[PDB]
C-alpha cells in the first residue's frame, strides 16, 4: 500500500515521504520499536521508521545477493549506508509521554559512551540539538526527525503530532552524526527490531 505498519505499536509509516530539507522523496527501508524497562516491566516508548534516498542502493552493490542474516551481522554494510552520499532519515513516533529527565538520561546514555572527549564542534552541535528539546513537552504522538545529509551534517525537527514540515536545527559534527547512527544500527541497537527490519528489506532489494 502507501503505508507500512509497525507490528508492535501499529504505528503507520508512509512508504514514500518528502522530508524537511531533503530534495528527493525518501523510501521506507524498515520499521521497529524501542522498549525500555523503567521500573518492573519493559514498555514500548516509540515506533521508528528508517528512510533512504533510493540512490544509495547502487552504492551497496557489493552486498548483492546476500541473506537478511548475513546483512544484519555485517557492520561494513551499515557503515556503508551511513557513508552513502545521499539523504537518510529516522522518523521516531512516541507512543507514550516522555518527561525531561527521561529524555536527557537517554540522550546522555546514547551520546556520552560514544563521544568520550567531545571536540568544541561536537559541544556546539549537541547544545544546538538539545536546545530544540528544552522546555518542550514530549507527549505521546510527538514525531522526531533525525535526518542525515552527509557524514557530518544533520537536520533535526520535532512536532507534537504529524510529520514535521520545518527544519528546527541544522548541526555540523561528524562525531555526533556518527554516534546517532550507531545508536540505531551499531552492535547494540536500541531497537533490534528496526535493524532487523532494515536488514530484511535490504536482502529483498539487493537481489
Ligand atoms: C527511553 C526514552 C527515550 C526517549 C526517546 C525520544 C527520541 C529522541 C531521539 C534522539 C536520539 C537519542 C538517542 C537515544 C535513543 C533511545 O535511547 O531510545
Swiss-Prot record:
It is found in: Plastid, Chloroplast stroma. GO terms for molecular function: fatty acid binding; intramolecular lyase activity. One of its GO terms (cellular component) is chloroplast. Its main location: plastid. GO terms for biological process: fatty acid metabolic process. Disulfide bonds: none annotated. Expressed in developing cotyledons, young seedlings, roots, seeds, embryos, macrospores, preanthesis and tapetum. Restricted to developing and reproductive tissues. Hexadecanoate binds at residues 34, 46. Disruption phenotype: Embryo lethal. Keywords: Acetylation, Chloroplast, Plastid, Transit peptide. It comes from the Eukaryota. Fatty-acid-binding protein. Interacts with most fatty acids tested and has maximal relative affinity for C16:0. Belongs to the chalcone isomerase family. This is Fatty-acid-binding protein 3, chloroplastic. It comes from Arabidopsis thaliana (Mouse-ear cress). The lineage of its organism: Eukaryota, Viridiplantae, Streptophyta, Embryophyta, Tracheophyta. The chain holds residues 81 to 287 of 287 of the full protein.
